[PDB]
Amino acid sequence: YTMSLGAENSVAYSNNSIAIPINFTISVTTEILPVSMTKTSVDCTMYICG
Amino acid sequence: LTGTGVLTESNKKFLPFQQFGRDIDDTTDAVRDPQTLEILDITPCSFGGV
Numbered sequence: 740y741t742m743s744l745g746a747e748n749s750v751a752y753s754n755n756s757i758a759i760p761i762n763f764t765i766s767v768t769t770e771i772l773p774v775s776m777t778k779t780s781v782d783c784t785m786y787i788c789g
Numbered sequence: 790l791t792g793t794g795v796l797t798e799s800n801k802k803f804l805p806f807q808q809f810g811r812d813i814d815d816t817t818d819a820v821r822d823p824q825t826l827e828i829l830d831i832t833p834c835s836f837g838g839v
């Protein structure tokens with residue numbers, strides 16, 4: 740199928756109306772970031788020639 | 790099949806038709822002695838950085 744970006748949400752804009760929140764949600768989200776790799780060392784002489 | 794290594798006793802039970810043993814990387818890490826049908830582990834010699 741042709742992908743859909745998101746559901747349409749037409750915001751009810753007018754020159755004299757505002758939307759004020761009456762409540763809140765404390766949301767905890769995860770962010771995973773790589774820091775280091777496996778430290779590898781290669782003996783060039785042994786690898787090429789044994 | 791030639792190489793250099795430390796030959797120790799092995800707990801791996803080979804099938805009777807199999808002679809050599811390979812790891813994921815297709816390197817011989819287990820072998821069967823031809824004279825006496827016993828399995829030997831081939832541990833690489835302790836090469837290291839100084």
Ligand SMILES: *[C@@H]1O[C@H](CO)[C@@H](O[C@@H]2O[C@H](CO)[C@@H](O)[C@H](O)[C@H]2NC(C)=O)[C@H](O)[C@H]1NC(C)=O
Binds near residue numbers: 750
């Ligand atoms: C604030 O008022 C506007 C206008 O009355 C609301 O917008 C409409 O909301 C209804 C309810 O689903 C929709 O069917 C209409 O299509 C909306 N109009 C537009 C132009 O988007 C809006 O929902 C109200 N806000 C709140 C929080 O109730």
Ligand SMILES: *[C@@H]1O[C@H](CO)[C@@H](O[C@@H]2O[C@H](CO)[C@@H](O)[C@H](O)[C@H]2NC(C)=O)[C@H](O)[C@H]1NC(C)=O
Binds near residue numbers: 761
């Ligand atoms: C704001 O939202 C919180 C939840 O996000 C509401 O707390 C809930 O209140 C109802 C009825 O008192 C309980 O049955 C729920 O268990 C409560 N939820 C939690 C997480 O405690 C709170 O009442 C909302 N406030 C307003 C003014 O709407």
Ligand SMILES: *[C@@H]1O[C@H](CO)[C@@H](O)[C@H](O)[C@H]1NC(C)=O
Binds near residue numbers: 823824825826
């Ligand atoms: C090889 O010969 C030796 C004795 O020379 C014997 O002990 C051993 O069992 C033999 N192995 C095989 C696989 O025939």
